[PDB]
Amino acid sequence: ASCGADKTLQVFKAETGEKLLEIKAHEDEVLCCAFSTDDRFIATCSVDKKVKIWNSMTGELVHTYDEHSEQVNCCHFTNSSHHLLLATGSSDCFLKLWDLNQKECRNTMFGHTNSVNHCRFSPDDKLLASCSADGTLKLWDATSANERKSINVKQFFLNLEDPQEDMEVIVKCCSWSADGARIMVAAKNKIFLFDIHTSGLLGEIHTGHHSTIQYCDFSPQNHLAVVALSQYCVELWNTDSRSKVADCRGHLSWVHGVMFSPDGSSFLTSSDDQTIRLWETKKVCKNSAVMLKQEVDVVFQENEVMVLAVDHIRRLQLINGRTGQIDYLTEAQVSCCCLSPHLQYIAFGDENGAIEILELVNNRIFQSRFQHKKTVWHIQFTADEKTLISSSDDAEIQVWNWQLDKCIFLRGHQETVKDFRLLKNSRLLSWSFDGTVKVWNIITGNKEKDFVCHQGTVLSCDISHDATKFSSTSADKTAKIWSFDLLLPLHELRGHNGCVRCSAFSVDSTLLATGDDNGEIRIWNVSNGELLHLCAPLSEEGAATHGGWVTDLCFSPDGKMLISAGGYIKWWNVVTGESSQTFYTNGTNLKKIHVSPDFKTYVTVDNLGILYILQTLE
């Protein structure tokens, strides 16, 4: 059984994967739910405070409870077949040990100094463990309706320069040993295995790198630990042995939760997308160094297309399409990368903002540039093989010629320059957080034409690429467009009260898409502007999943088609209706567009799903 934000709960039999239960509503948004030990009941926690224990078979309500001063944190039926109790944590910090055989609570239990994080009955029904943000375990004596034991948790020792003394551990999951005789837990940067019966620490499984745990899950089999540290980092660790077994890429939205089968042979994976992925236990252990890194740059030189990649462990590997030809390289984790014009070189940024340009002919030859307060942002090369150009936290736009080691700067006096692009001339287009659409010069810094198209930041600005005849931008205000000849845009489109978020020019035509936040596109003729039929690519959908963001538009060479890419690719026919809408991406959330000069093949990698290559046939 899974609930949701709607607060309806749906109960299902996983095998045949077919609806086995529909529940009409739960008052207030569901907070959590759970089966009875004999699966004869289903408790349902909620913000309302209506502990609705519906029958698991008839589906009709049986038990119901309320006592909490605040919203319930957790509900669970007694693991014992005999005793019928309902331990319930809540934001009011008070535990409520319900007697399921009675309408009123068997025992209120103040104890936690912070709101309860999780709650479970102990295999010994006489005992009742509990957890909370203070992090200390609390093994209550339910039989006496009184405190018995409560391990302190400062075991995550960490002597930082932090003014706070010993760290205040915040345990989340209340994991149990398969016998339940001891309590596995996890918090911050470390898993622990406390022995509540002796009231002392035993195990301590450190998590990957350092941060603060968002989710964790012990596995009684194989001493496994499926832990979602942060950003859906659902690694498969191995407890006690204290070493990772294997990586598990594949949830979008950063997981929302995971739990193993009672057999332990499988586990569910609830996620923010609204998705639950079943998984076999065996598959996770095996290694699978795949699924390229989420953001990459690909450069297309004809018949074979090469995609930029970040190594699964360290730097990078270049894998050409239609081949197994890996091209690994070494560096202390490159921040970003860029190939030189007319090939012959390769380059990368750094966390310090330093930017090396390794030669292809010889690994010994390189130039390293030290610049920028932080990691370098945008990087672009001149039409000449020489002269690096870059930007970052600095207000200035860096122009560092390599070999010559020249350091020309674009002194824009901005808080920072957000991004910049090459113009067909010696001019260098740019824009910052003040939303100025500056027109500088390449190599030599010189702000020749200056535009203030937006008081706010330039959200997405696209330049057409035939001559320098036009350029346009939209930034949650107006879709301005100019020919550079004027200091102000030739037209200021105002056809969208919801304000256009992004725009892209036609492939040497007269079309000009204007993307909305909801993925809506409004095509505009490159002639001041006129009420052209909106491309209107998405009309009916909802908040389902993999849909947010109007990242890019890829016009067909014919110009008769727009390749919209938000939650998934859809080839919306230009002006009214759609052409080849179909597709549907596995990853979702593509953020980049690459097109071959021919325009035959575009491959998208979205959400780290992987890179997908398309090659239409006859």
Binding site: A5, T212, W254, K418, T457, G548
Partner: protein, 104 residues
Amino acid sequence: GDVEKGKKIFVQKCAQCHTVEKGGKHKTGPNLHGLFGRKTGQAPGFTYTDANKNKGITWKEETLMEYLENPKKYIPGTKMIFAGIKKKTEREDLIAYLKKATNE
């Protein structure tokens, strides 16, 4: 909005990941002091996602009203976990409280 109710909502739903006082520490989320009239992703000393860092909007009542209804929808890929405040009144109250407290 009702600033007092807004405070309650902040205490209940935001305080576990964010401070509003000047020099208040970064918790899971960034300190919100000075939020109004500031562009997304600018609290110095907080490491944002690229999505939040590049949303490119100015925080103010209109943008907050939309964000707080459904953060993920407004900034897909945000690492902020929050379903959203579905009732407008509560949103207005919270926003009115934040407007006061994040300047104070």
